Amino acid sequence: SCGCFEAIMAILPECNGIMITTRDHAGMTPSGMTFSTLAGMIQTPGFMGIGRTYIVSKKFISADGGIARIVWMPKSLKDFLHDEFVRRSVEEGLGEDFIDKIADETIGTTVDEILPYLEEKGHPALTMDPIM
Ligand code: NI
Ligand code: NI
């Protein structure tokens, strides 16, 4: 949370997961804010500024579920980490196709449009321990 972070992650209580947006993504996100807005008040409780590399680390939010908690990411971020992410998805036992269960602006920018999708795809985060 200094000022070099390429991405920001926020908790999405309604999806029992977390979202992630990036510095170069201008879209609105399920948290009701763009990266710019989140950046303007970043470390607060509920969200933190991070390096994209962190996302594919064995340590990534380890205590709270790791990768499994991610329900939304910009398509561009998925592309940037794809190979790395699929790898981690497999080692975590989520299946190589886990990345396709994660929503993006290709599905929606709000919780309301996203939940339906997460349910259809049987996203793991919906049946895990309460994120909080
Ligand atoms: Ni920082
Ligand atoms: Ni920084």
Side-chain angles (χ1 to χ4, degrees), residues 1-42 45-132:
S1 298
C2 27
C4 63
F5 47 82
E6 283 299 309
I8 289 167
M9 71 180 167
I11 300 176
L12 253 33
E14 203 58 51
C15 299
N16 199 49
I18 74 178
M19 95 172 64
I20 298 171
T21 184
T22 61
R23 194 172 288 286
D24 63 29
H25 191 264
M28 185 65 49
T29 77
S31 57
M33 303 169 254
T34 50
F35 176 100
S36 324
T37 300
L38 290 156
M41 71 192 109
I42 202 65
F47 47 85
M48 170 182 27
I50 62 162
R52 294 163 299 177
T53 317
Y54 179 60
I55 308 180
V56 286
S57 297
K58 285 282 192 171
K59 298 291 72 183
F60 176 79
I61 243 55
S62 58
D64 306 293
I67 253 37
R69 295 289 191 184
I70 303 167
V71 300
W72 193 96
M73 284 187 290
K75 187 68 182 61
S76 65
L77 173 58
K78 280 182 186 178
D79 289 336
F80 178 96
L81 300 175
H82 194 271
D83 295 343
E84 310 272 36
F85 197 88
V86 174
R87 200 161 317 193
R88 296 290 297 98
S89 294
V90 179
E91 308 181 334
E92 296 292 315
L94 300 176
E96 57 190 66
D97 69 321
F98 173 68
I99 195 175
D100 303 303
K101 290 176 182 169
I102 298 186
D104 49 48
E105 74 278 44
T106 261
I107 305 315
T109 57
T110 65
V111 166
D112 321 54
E113 318 159 88
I114 272 58
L115 267 180
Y117 185 82
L118 295 175
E119 278 165 23
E120 305 192 324
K121 292 300 179 185
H123 190 289
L126 291 179
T127 53
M128 290 179 71
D129 281 33
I131 187 66
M132 313 303 322

